[PDB]
């Protein structure tokens, strides 16, 4: 049986509004309703992995697992295995996978982050799962962020706290947060960003939704506008939204949006909004294609509609040679030429680089670079030709071209990272000097750039 080079992943996010689900939720897992839907001809074909995020979930883990497994069985006639389940308060993540994948999946991690202090620590935060699928790392985050049209800043703070403090993936990647630890990172949930228009425009917004004219509404979506201004989800992708706002509906129909202020809302308006979202971040030049992104029309127990997204995701095999793992393959090397970091920091310390990759036996510290002043005020850290020669464990190009090098630039004084980035080894040529580039981030904020040239030698 050949190892896969592609899998499909189902991502679901549903704020259940503290109500039991109805008896049939199969439309969700079939990506049927509004938006980018899945072709009918695929209905009997199981996804490899199903990741279900819920918020305001009133069910026990046992109750929800039984509904999910029975749903997938009815659709596909496959009995899915449970990879992971993690619940913080009423926020839950379930990872199910085809039985054939049991022995491909390892290094299963779960964590949660609680957002807010005293007042605002009580019910919002995130849960997550990570694991290895053969040679590919996969991360999944389900977040319920702060509610309310006037709290978009709070939501961006909740996001930053979750990405800094969620402990998933390989703990040896100590300078790297979850936005660098995975080949593919899926981040979904009730992100609670709103359509930011005047309250007086509510009936006009509803009119626009009934005409399926979302363009004027999406131009005021806080997640898109905050993303555009690099305030949140920097370097993440989202598929185009072509489904109606998934919030806030009257229960037991989808014909009415309940937007008017009520005691039960703290006297806040809930203008129709795309609260419920799926975003992703994959390492450079890895295959990732969104094949569906939409909302169900027929599940009406909650004031939110379920959202589905499906993805084709590139995976690699667990490579073994005569040499690595357990030694270097002296036929392979990675060289860096004319490298310099540009940092936004106003500090003056010396900096050095760390290279981390599963293609290395362990991480590699460089010598200190030479600080110069950029023409526009920037700190430029010059490495020239001084960066070490990296010795991959395997030189076979079918392995090595599929790998990535994570880079941290660290202060000599404190050993704290000032920036993290990622370089693909999927080069246009081997044994050829080729430009490389990564933005650098720290706590998910842009802190600079790394650029130069690479020269990769494989056994070919
Ligand atoms: O090529 C990808 C696709 C677009 N990305 C840049 C971008 C990110 C967020 C927004 Cl809102 C708009 C544009 C980079």
UniProtKB/Swiss-Prot annotation:
Specifically expressed in immune and hematopoietic cells. Expressed in bone marrow and blood cells. Levels vary considerably within this compartment. Present in at least 74% of immature CD34+ cells, whereas within the more mature population of CD33+ cells, it is present in only 10% of cells. Present in the majority of T-cells, while it is present in a minority of B-cells (at protein level). It is found in: Cytoplasm; Cell membrane; Membrane raft; Cytoplasm, Cytoskeleton. Tyrosine phosphorylated by the members of the SRC family after exposure to a diverse array of extracellular stimuli such as cytokines, growth factors, antibodies, chemokines, integrin ligands and hypertonic and oxidative stress. Phosphorylated upon IgG receptor FCGR2B-binding. Phosphatidylinositol (PtdIns) phosphatase that specifically hydrolyzes the 5-phosphate of phosphatidylinositol-3,4,5-trisphosphate (PtdIns(3,4,5)P3) to produce PtdIns(3,4)P2, thereby negatively regulating the PI3K (phosphoinositide 3-kinase) pathways. Able also to hydrolyzes the 5-phosphate of phosphatidylinositol-4,5-bisphosphate (PtdIns(4,5)P3) and inositol 1,3,4,5-tetrakisphosphate. Acts as a negative regulator of B-cell antigen receptor signaling. Interacts with tyrosine phosphorylated form of SHC1. Interacts with tyrosine phosphorylated form of DOK1. Interacts with tyrosine phosphorylated form of DOK3. Interacts with tyrosine phosphorylated form of SLAMF1/CD150. Interacts with PTPN11 in response to IL-3. Interacts with receptor EPOR. Interacts with receptors MS4A2/FCER1B and FCER1G. Interacts with receptors FCGR2B and FCGR3. Interacts with receptor FCGR2A, leading to regulate gene expression during the phagocytic process. Interacts with GRB2. Interacts with PLCG1. Interacts with tyrosine kinases SRC and TEC. Interacts with c-Met/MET. The SH2 domain interacts with tyrosine phosphorylated forms of proteins such as SHC1 or PTPN11/SHP-2. It competes with that of GRB2 for binding to phosphorylated SHC1 to inhibit the Ras pathway. It is also required for tyrosine phosphorylation. The NPXY sequence motif found in many tyrosine-phosphorylated proteins is required for the specific binding of the PID domain. Belongs to the inositol 1,4,5-trisphosphate 5-phosphatase family. This is Phosphatidylinositol 3,4,5-trisphosphate 5-phosphatase 1.
